[PDB]
Write an enzyme that holds these catalytic residues in place. Sequence first.
Site, PDB file in Angstrom:
ATOM      1  N   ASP A 160      12.729  27.017   7.739  1.00 58.75           N
ATOM      2  CA  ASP A 160      13.682  26.246   8.613  1.00 58.75           C
ATOM      3  C   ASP A 160      13.480  26.423   9.978  1.00 58.75           C
ATOM      4  O   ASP A 160      12.242  26.661  10.474  1.00 58.75           O
ATOM      5  CB  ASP A 160      15.145  26.321   8.551  1.00 58.75           C
ATOM      6  N   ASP A 186      27.077  38.661  10.846  1.00 60.87           N
ATOM      7  CA  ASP A 186      27.144  38.607   9.436  1.00 60.87           C
ATOM      8  C   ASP A 186      25.824  38.419   8.626  1.00 60.87           C
ATOM      9  O   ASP A 186      26.061  38.293   7.526  1.00 60.87           O
ATOM     10  CB  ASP A 186      28.016  37.237   9.114  1.00 60.87           C
ATOM     11  N   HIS A 231      19.986  25.488  12.232  1.00 57.37           N
ATOM     12  CA  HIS A 231      20.237  25.283  10.736  1.00 57.37           C
ATOM     13  C   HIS A 231      19.732  26.501   9.834  1.00 57.37           C
ATOM     14  O   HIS A 231      20.450  26.664   9.059  1.00 57.37           O
ATOM     15  CB  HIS A 231      19.524  24.018  10.419  1.00 57.37           C
ATOM     16  N   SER A 243      20.956  19.341   2.305  1.00 56.87           N
ATOM     17  CA  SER A 243      20.159  20.568   3.100  1.00 56.87           C
ATOM     18  C   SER A 243      21.181  21.773   3.075  1.00 56.87           C
ATOM     19  O   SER A 243      20.670  22.981   3.347  1.00 56.87           O
ATOM     20  CB  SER A 243      19.810  19.885   4.374  1.00 56.87           C
TER      21      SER A 243
HETATM   22  C1  LIG Z   1      -2.784  15.011   5.476  1.00 56.74           C
HETATM   23  C2  LIG Z   1      -2.054  16.175   6.115  1.00 56.74           C
HETATM   24  O1  LIG Z   1      -2.343  17.005   6.429  1.00 56.74           O
HETATM   25  N1  LIG Z   1      -0.500  15.912   5.924  1.00 56.74           N
HETATM   26  C3  LIG Z   1       0.258  16.814   6.785  1.00 56.74           C
HETATM   27  C4  LIG Z   1       1.707  16.477   6.537  1.00 56.74           C
HETATM   28  C5  LIG Z   1       2.630  17.337   7.170  1.00 56.74           C
HETATM   29  C6  LIG Z   1       4.185  16.875   7.022  1.00 56.74           C
HETATM   30  N2  LIG Z   1       4.592  17.222   5.366  1.00 56.74           N
HETATM   31  C7  LIG Z   1       5.880  16.658   5.324  1.00 56.74           C
HETATM   32  C8  LIG Z   1       7.029  17.503   6.062  1.00 56.74           C
HETATM   33  C9  LIG Z   1       7.550  17.096   7.211  1.00 56.74           C
HETATM   34  C10 LIG Z   1       8.358  18.206   7.876  1.00 56.74           C
HETATM   35  C11 LIG Z   1       8.820  17.795   9.311  1.00 56.74           C
HETATM   36  N3  LIG Z   1      10.090  17.399   9.607  1.00 56.74           N
HETATM   37  C12 LIG Z   1      11.116  17.866   8.359  1.00 56.74           C
HETATM   38  C13 LIG Z   1      12.538  17.829   9.122  1.00 56.74           C
HETATM   39  N4  LIG Z   1      12.683  18.837  10.498  1.00 56.74           N
HETATM   40  C14 LIG Z   1      13.837  18.985  10.926  1.00 56.74           C
HETATM   41  C15 LIG Z   1      15.132  18.364  10.040  1.00 56.74           C
HETATM   42  C16 LIG Z   1      16.231  18.568  10.741  1.00 56.74           C
HETATM   43  N5  LIG Z   1      16.423  18.986  12.016  1.00 56.74           N
HETATM   44  C17 LIG Z   1      15.354  19.188  12.855  1.00 56.74           C
HETATM   45  C18 LIG Z   1      13.981  19.074  12.261  1.00 56.74           C
HETATM   46  C19 LIG Z   1      11.346  18.825  10.865  1.00 56.74           C
HETATM   47  C20 LIG Z   1      10.696  17.543  10.946  1.00 56.74           C
HETATM   48  C21 LIG Z   1       8.802  19.167   7.200  1.00 56.74           C
HETATM   49  C22 LIG Z   1       8.117  19.389   5.967  1.00 56.74           C
HETATM   50  C23 LIG Z   1       8.639  20.816   5.131  1.00 56.74           C
HETATM   51  C24 LIG Z   1      10.075  21.348   5.371  1.00 56.74           C
HETATM   52  C25 LIG Z   1      10.181  22.711   4.801  1.00 56.74           C
HETATM   53 CL1  LIG Z   1      11.859  23.237   5.016  1.00 56.74          CL
HETATM   54  C26 LIG Z   1       9.228  23.374   4.005  1.00 56.74           C
HETATM   55  C27 LIG Z   1       7.928  22.871   4.013  1.00 56.74           C
HETATM   56 CL2  LIG Z   1       6.916  23.706   3.243  1.00 56.74          CL
HETATM   57  C28 LIG Z   1       7.586  21.456   4.712  1.00 56.74           C
HETATM   58  C29 LIG Z   1       7.471  18.663   5.468  1.00 56.74           C
HETATM   59  C30 LIG Z   1       3.631  16.089   4.816  1.00 56.74           C
HETATM   60  C31 LIG Z   1       2.095  16.681   5.023  1.00 56.74           C
HETATM   61 CA   LIG Z   2      31.284  38.374   6.183  1.00 55.03          CA
END
Ligand SMILES: CC(=O)NCC1CCN(Cc2cc(CN3CCN(c4ccncc4)CC3)cc(-c3cc(Cl)cc(Cl)c3)c2)CC1
Ligand SMILES: [Ca+2]
Length: 471
Positions: free
Chosen positions: A44, A53, A85, A259
Site C-alpha cells: 500500500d 498499536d 491507508h 479495500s
Molecule cells: C504494460 C505495463 O508495463 N503495464 C504496467 C501497469 C502498471 C499498473 N498496473 C495496475 C495497477 C495500478 C495501480 C496504481 N493505482 C492503484 C490505486 N492507488 C491508490 C489508491 C488509493 N489511494 C491512493 C492511491 C494508486 C494508483 C496499483 C496496482 C497495484 C496495487 C497493489 Cl496494492 C498491488 C499491486 Cl501488485 C499492484 C496495479 C497494471 C500494469
Molecule cells: Ca490495541
Amino acid sequence: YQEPTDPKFPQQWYLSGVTQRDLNVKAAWAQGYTGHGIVVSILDDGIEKNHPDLAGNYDPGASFDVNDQDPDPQPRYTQMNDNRHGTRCAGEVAAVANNGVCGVGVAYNARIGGVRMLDGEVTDAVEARSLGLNPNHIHIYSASWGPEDDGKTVDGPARLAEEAFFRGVSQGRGGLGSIFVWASGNGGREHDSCNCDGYTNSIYTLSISSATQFGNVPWYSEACSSTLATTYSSGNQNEKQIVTTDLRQKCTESHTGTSASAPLAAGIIALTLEANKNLTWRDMQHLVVQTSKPAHLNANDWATNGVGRKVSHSYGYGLLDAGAMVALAQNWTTVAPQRKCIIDILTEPKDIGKRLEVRKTVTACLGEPNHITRLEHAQARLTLSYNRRGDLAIHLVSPMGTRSTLLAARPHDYSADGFNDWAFMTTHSWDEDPSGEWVLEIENTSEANNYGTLTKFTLVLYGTASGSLVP
Ligand SMILES: CC(=O)NCC1CCN(Cc2cc(CN3CCN(c4ccncc4)CC3)cc(-c3cc(Cl)cc(Cl)c3)c2)CC1
Ligand SMILES: [Ca+2]
Ligand SMILES: *[C@@H]1O[C@H](CO)[C@@H](O)[C@H](O)[C@H]1NC(C)=O
Ligand SMILES: [Ca+2]
Ligand SMILES: [Ca+2]
Ligand SMILES: [Cl-]
Ligand code: NA
Ligand code: NA
Ligand code: NA
Ligand code: NA
C-alpha cells in the site's frame, strides 16, 4: 480465554459481536490461535511503524519502500493524510492486543510489515518487486487496490508482476506458495465488473468482497465470478465501519470499502496458517471454499453449484469464518499437485452480433496426467473484437449447470479494443467434475446494432483427480 481489553475492541463489531454477525474470530482466539509466528505484509502507501498499536508487532523484514528504493516504509505525511491507508490496513491484521490503545488485529500476535509502493508511479517493476518481497519470510501479502475502478478499464499484471505471482506461488514460502489476498474492488457505483481486474481475477490471489453490517451488498461492491469469499466492511451511515490504527498515532472508526475487507481476510488467513503451517496456497483456497458461510448475506443471485455449495458473484462462498478455518486447517490433508487441462474450443471464428452461444463437450484431458475430475479454478480465455465492449455480457455454464457470469455489462466501457486473450476466471464450479458440456454465452445487452467476432476461446481447467468430499 479472556477477550481483549483494548478501549475500542467493543466497537470492533465484526470481531466482538455476540449477535452472530461477525467473523467468528473469538472462536479461533479461544482455540489458541492469534497469529504467533506468522508474517503479513500490506502492499500500500506505507506503514507507520512507530504507531503505538503497531510497533510491538512491526517486522522490518516484512517491509520495504519500493517508491523511494529504501528499506523504510514510513508514510509521507501530508496535510490531507493521504498516505494513511496502509497503516489502517496493518492494524486490521495485527494491531497489538491488551495494551490500552485503540482495538486489536484479527491476528494480534502476528508480525506485520508494509510495502510502500502506491506513493509514486506504479510500474510493472514496482509491482513485481513488491509482490516478490522477501518471499521466504513473508507468508501472506495483502493488497487492497489495482487498476482503476472506473468501470471502463481492463488491465492486469504485466510480465514482471505475473512472473512474481508464479514465482511466489511456486517457490515462495519454502515451496508452499505465497498467499496473496486481494480486494475485489471499489467500483460498484461505476458498475464495474471485477473480472476486468487481472489481479483479483488471478487464480493466484485469494479474492475478497464486502458485506455491510446489516448483511447487504455495499454500494461500492463489484460482482464477479473470480471472488472467493467475503468479510464485513462499511455500508450506509446507520451501519458501523472498520475500527483500526490511523496515521499520526491515532485510531479511526471510519475505515471503509472492499479495500478494508482484504486485510481482515489476511488476518483470518494468518490465524489459519498458525493452525497448520504446512498449508499450500491452494490448500488455503480450499479451506475458504469449504468453511465460508452464506447465512444472513442478502443477494438476489445465490445459486447452488454442482456440489451443493451456495455461491454468489457478490460474496463468493460467503463470509469468512475464522473458527471454522482454524478447526479444519489442523488435520487438513495437502491437496494433490495442480493439474491444468487446456481445451481449444473453436473450429472457426464466430460472429457475435446480437447473441452468440458456443457449446462444447469436453473430456477434461481424459487419459492424460492433466485429467481433472475435481475442478478448482476454471478460465474462459477469450479473444474477441467488438465495437463497444461494455455492451457485452458473458456467461459460462459448467456441465453441472452452474452459470458463472464472466462479464456483466459495463455502461461506461466504450472501448472498441475488445479482449485480447483475457482469462475470465470463475471459482463457482470448485470441486465439480468438469467433464461434459460447457456453454459460453456472449450477448449484446444494448439495443444498438453492435458487431464483432470471437476468434479464440480456450477453456482452461485447473484441479486434481482425487480426494473429493460428499456434496
Ligand atoms: C504494460 C505495463 O508495463 N503495464 C504496467 C501497469 C502498471 C499498473 N498496473 C495496475 C495497477 C495500478 C495501480 C496504481 N493505482 C492503484 C490505486 N492507488 C491508490 C489508491 C488509493 N489511494 C491512493 C492511491 C494508486 C494508483 C496499483 C496496482 C497495484 C496495487 C497493489 Cl496494492 C498491488 C499491486 Cl501488485 C499492484 C496495479 C497494471 C500494469
Ligand atoms: Ca490495541
Ligand atoms: C507438509 O506436506 C507435505 C505434503 O503432504 C508432506 O510431504 C510433508 O511431510 C509435510 N510437512 C509437515 C511438517 O507436516
Ligand atoms: Ca522510505
Ligand atoms: Ca474494479
Ligand atoms: Cl498455469
Ligand atoms: Na480496485
Ligand atoms: Na483471485
Ligand atoms: Na445448480
Ligand atoms: Na460431466
